[PDB]
Amino acid sequence: TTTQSYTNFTRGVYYPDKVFRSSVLHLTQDLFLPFFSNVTWFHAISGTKRFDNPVLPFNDGVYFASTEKSNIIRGWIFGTTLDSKTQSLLIVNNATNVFIKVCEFQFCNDPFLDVYMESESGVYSSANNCTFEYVSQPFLKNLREFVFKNIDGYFKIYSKHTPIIGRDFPQGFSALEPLVDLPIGINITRFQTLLALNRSYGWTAGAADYYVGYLQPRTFLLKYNENGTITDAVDCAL
Amino acid sequence: FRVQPTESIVRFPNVTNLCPFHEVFNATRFASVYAWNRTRISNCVADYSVLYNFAPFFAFKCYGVSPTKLNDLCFTNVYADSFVIKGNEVSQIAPGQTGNIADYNYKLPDDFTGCVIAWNSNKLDSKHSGNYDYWYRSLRKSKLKPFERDISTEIYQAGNKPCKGKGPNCYFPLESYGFRPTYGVGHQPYRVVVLSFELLHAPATVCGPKKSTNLVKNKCVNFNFNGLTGTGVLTKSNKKFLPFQQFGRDIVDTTDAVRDPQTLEILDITPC
Ligand SMILES: *[C@@H]1O[C@H](CO)[C@@H](O[C@@H]2O[C@H](CO)[C@@H](O)[C@H](O)[C@H]2NC(C)=O)[C@H](O)[C@H]1NC(C)=O
Ligand SMILES: *[C@@H]1O[C@H](CO)[C@@H](O)[C@H](O)[C@H]1NC(C)=O
Ligand SMILES: *[C@@H]1O[C@H](CO)[C@@H](O)[C@H](O)[C@H]1NC(C)=O
Ligand SMILES: *[C@@H]1O[C@H](CO)[C@@H](O)[C@H](O)[C@H]1NC(C)=O
Ligand SMILES: *[C@@H]1O[C@H](CO)[C@@H](O)[C@H](O)[C@H]1NC(C)=O
Ligand SMILES: *[C@@H]1O[C@H](CO)[C@@H](O)[C@H](O)[C@H]1NC(C)=O
Ligand SMILES: *[C@@H]1O[C@H](CO)[C@@H](O)[C@H](O)[C@H]1NC(C)=O
Numbered sequence: 485t486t487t488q489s490y491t492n493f494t495r496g497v498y499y500p501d502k503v504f505r506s507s508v509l510h511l512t513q514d515l516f517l518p519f520f521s522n523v524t525w526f527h528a529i530s531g532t533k534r535f536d537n538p539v540l541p542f543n544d545g546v547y548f549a550s551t552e553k554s555n556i557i558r559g560w561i562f563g564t565t566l567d568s569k570t571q572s573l574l575i576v577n578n579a580t581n582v583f584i585k586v587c588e589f590q591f592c593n594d595p596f597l598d599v600y601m602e603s604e605s606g607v608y609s610s611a612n613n614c615t616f617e618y619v620s621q622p623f624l625k626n627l628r629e630f631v632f633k634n635i636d637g638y639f640k641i642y643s644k645h646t647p648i649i650g651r652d653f654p655q656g657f658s659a660l661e662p663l664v665d666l667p668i669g670i671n672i673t674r675f676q677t678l679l680a681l682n683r684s685y686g687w688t689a690g691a692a693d694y695y696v697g698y699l700q701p702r703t704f705l706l707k708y709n710e711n712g713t714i715t716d717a718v719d720c721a722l
Numbered sequence: 723f724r725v726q727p728t729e730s731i732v733r734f735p736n737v738t739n740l741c742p743f744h745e746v747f748n749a750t751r752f753a754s755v756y757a758w759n760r761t762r763i764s765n766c767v768a769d770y771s772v773l774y775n776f777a778p779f780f781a782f783k784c785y786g787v788s789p790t791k792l793n794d795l796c797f798t799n800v801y802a803d804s805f806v807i808k809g810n811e812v813s814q815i816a817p818g819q820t821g822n823i824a825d826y827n828y829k830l831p832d833d834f835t836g837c838v839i840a841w842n843s844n845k846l847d848s849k850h851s852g853n854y855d856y857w858y859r860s861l862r863k864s865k866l867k868p869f870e871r872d873i874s875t876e877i878y879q880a881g882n883k884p885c886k887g888k889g890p891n892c893y894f895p896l897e898s899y900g901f902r903p904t905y906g907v908g909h910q911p912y913r914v915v916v917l918s919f920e921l922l923h924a925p926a927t928v929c930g931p932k933k934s935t936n937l938v939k940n941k942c943v944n945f946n947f948n949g950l951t952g953t954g955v956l957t958k959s960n961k962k963f964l965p966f967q968q969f970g971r972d973i974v975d976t977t978d979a980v981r982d983p984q985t986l987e988i989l990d991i992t993p994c
């Protein structure tokens with residue numbers, strides 16, 4: 485949409501491993517959102533939408549977050565060309581489940597879903613040569629944070645849902661937890677946020693905000709408390 | 723004197739779904755090496771004795787986990803990359819070798835920890851008039867990286883021309899293996915399956931055919947939890963593991979707790 489930049493996000497820390505630690509100062513080198521990084525803020529009001537969805541670079545990994553009350557953002561598209569020439573990853577959310585499909589898609593010129601039920605044909609005209617399907621529970625006032633990392637053929641999704649009672653991001657620390665490890669082997673260089681903007685059956689429709697940051701290799705200290713929950717972290721490169 | 727282990731306890735997941743090794747090895751047709759067939763083995767019991775039942779093998783050559791006694795391990799994921807290559811190119815599947823296959827069709831990682839299984843298929847993959855179904859790539863602009871499949875058949879650039887049309891200097895990127903029943907062993911087809919093993923302790927498992935036994939607590943026990951083995955005393959833990967954590971570590975980064983494969987109860991481990 486239209487992108488402001490934000491310099492003050494102290495967020496994006498996640499559990500780098502699958503091993504429990506408590507009361508530990510742990511030093512690790514991994515892909516993290518740097519503290520005080522340049523994070524782009526996307527703000528759209530929905531005639532159809534504020535502006536047609538942009539396609540963003542993926543780089544090393546993506547930090548995605550939103551505080552959306554209208555529940556319009558319900559998925560992402562990941563891949564290279566994002567057309568019928570290559571295989572791509574479609575992650576969509578709905579009222580009952582999360583549907584992840586890896587196939588050779590031909591997404592339509594207008595990526596955004598039409599919600600009126602939901603019609604799959606509003607995202608892509610067709611898809612073939614499908615190799616992977618997987619179903620999870622819905623990823624759902626509340627600020628929804630996700631980290632998408634593409635490492636050694638595995639698409640790893642981390643997430644957290646943190647309640648907010650004000651307008652601004654909470655001033656505090658919250659670490660993301662692993663959500664799903666997808667054994668795909670997909671080459672991802674570009675991605676797009678999919679907006680499930682409904683027809684108000686030129687029309688007025690609900691707004692959608694999100695924040696996008698990028699991960700970089702960094703060394704961090706992570707403070708693990710008695711319950712093994714990360715409560716603080718120090719970016720050793722800052 | 724009971725400081726030494728007084729019991730031997732094996733705990734593995736209760737999985738009765740046999741891994742589909744027969745189907746990948748006994749497939750009617752195999753993919754060309756330039757576009758090998760990559761499948762995935764998971765959520766199954768990794769019984770490897772069936773491989774010896776399947777066929778006599780030319781080479782087995784497990785790397786990294788060099789022992790072939792794989793029935794005691796649990797892998798997070800197992801991949802199987804199947805293809806047909808000629809006998810003289812079998813040696814090019816080893817991680818450190820070069821040549822037409824290692825460089826342009828199937829580069830294997832230098833730190834690869836799996837097994838390369840080769841089977842002579844001269845009676846199956848060689849037609850009287852010649853088997854021309856199998857293709858291999860010989861021309862690329864760069865060397866192939868580990869586990870990438872370069873599928874495109876776009877004509878390979880040559881000389882200083884835009885390279886449109888074949889013959890004068892441009893080449894089709896694939897050459898084909900015209901297999902004949904009368905060729906010697908060096909030129910006979912071989913069906914090669916590379917089993918890629920991810921040994922990362924055990925955040926998830928594909929375990930071999932081990933029989934789990936009952937847990938013993940408050941005793942010095944020789945234990946094996948999934949892919950992690952050791953000696954110690956098992957006790958009920960009061961640690962709060964997250965739903966996704968399978969293990970724990972002490973302040974010195976050594977194992978001090980496990981999640982039981984059958985009950986998901988967290989147990990602490992104290993050395994004897
Ligand atoms: C590549 O491997 C896949 C396995 O993941 C093969 O797909 C199986 O093919 C057999 C053929 O008899 C079927 O019975 C299975 O049900 C298939 N399973 C799946 C998940 O597709 C595929 O045929 C292989 N391709 C080649 C060319 O060997
Ligand atoms: C800095 O953070 C506060 C929240 O603590 C936010 O309101 C403010 O907009 C941020 N700074 C910029 C550059 O907008
Ligand atoms: C952040 O990056 C965007 C381009 O992606 C740029 O427009 C913006 O000025 C940058 N902000 C800072 C503070 O460097
Ligand atoms: C959500 O997507 C799954 C994927 O197939 C589908 O089975 C389910 O019915 C969908 N739910 C709704 C409410 O559309
Ligand atoms: C699927 O892949 C095969 C590979 O040979 C190709 O020939 C076929 O056209 C593809 N079909 C699609 C993308 O619909
Ligand atoms: C992934 O896509 C980028 C951009 O097209 C390309 O440069 C890179 O070589 C690709 N890698 C693989 C393994 O396909
Ligand atoms: C469409 O969405 C808007 C808010 O985005 C909502 O107020 C309206 O009732 C919706 N209409 C239908 C038919 O779902």
Ligand SMILES: *[C@@H]1O[C@H](CO)[C@@H](O)[C@H](O)[C@H]1NC(C)=O
Pocket residue numbers: 709710711
């Ligand atoms: C961790 O221990 C308790 C156990 O539930 C937890 O509620 C609290 O947040 C933590 N207590 C201390 C003392 O760290």
Ligand SMILES: *[C@@H]1O[C@H](CO)[C@@H](O)[C@H](O)[C@H]1NC(C)=O
Pocket residue numbers: 748775776777
């Ligand atoms: C493979 O499948 C054929 C199908 O008839 C069967 O006869 C044979 O015993 C199977 N096993 C081997 C090792 O060929």
Ligand SMILES: *[C@@H]1O[C@H](CO)[C@@H](O)[C@H](O)[C@H]1NC(C)=O
Pocket residue numbers: 736983984985
């Ligand atoms: C089989 O394993 C599952 C894993 O959660 C466990 O819940 C179940 O009780 C096991 N079966 C038996 C008979 O104990």
